[PDB]
């Protein structure tokens, strides 16, 4: 689950 990924994809 967690938090939305803040890094570039």
């Amino acid at each position: 689950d967690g938090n939305p990924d803040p890094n570039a994809n």
Partner: antibody
Amino acid sequence: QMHLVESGGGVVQPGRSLRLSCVASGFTFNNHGMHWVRQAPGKGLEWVAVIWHDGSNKFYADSVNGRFIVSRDNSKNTLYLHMNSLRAEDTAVYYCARDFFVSGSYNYFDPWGQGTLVTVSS
Amino acid sequence: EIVLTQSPVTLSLSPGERATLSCRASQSVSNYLAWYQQKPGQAPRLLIYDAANRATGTPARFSGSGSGTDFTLTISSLEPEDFAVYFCQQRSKWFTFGPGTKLDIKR
């Protein structure tokens, strides 16, 4: 080598404003979310704020939401923290930290800067 | 907020002994837990992430495990540089840290 260096800390009166900066080198700054984390004197660590790699989203700890604003200038490889409505309880060393990601994991803090000390007092 | 509690609050051991540090979350954080080391006057350093993965440069004597609410950091054969403060951190619901366990040298 990867490196983060903060600046801008100092003594600030409650109610006043202060801007912190964090300059990055040694990694691709625009690929990473960036974080602010703080540590009150002799206390533990408290996450402060996160900003998306492209600056599109910003989230804040409950204790600073609405009073602190996080921003970044990828052209300068720099992260900012705009601290308004400062209170004595905001006294802490402020660290900037990169969002460390590998494989499917993310949202850990590596590397860290050396920290900058903000002292809020009248 | 997800509260992380660390036990024992302090640990006193001799070099060469094994240290066992516990972190308990107030609700399940899956395996989204990291461990950090901090020495006086220095910034924290990432040691373990995703409960059990060693970060680059973390020596083999550091190992972590756990899931849900209960997590364990083990330091085998303590070296003098290992005596420091250790924080756990979850990233399941935003980001919170434990208050730290201080490991000092038993004399």
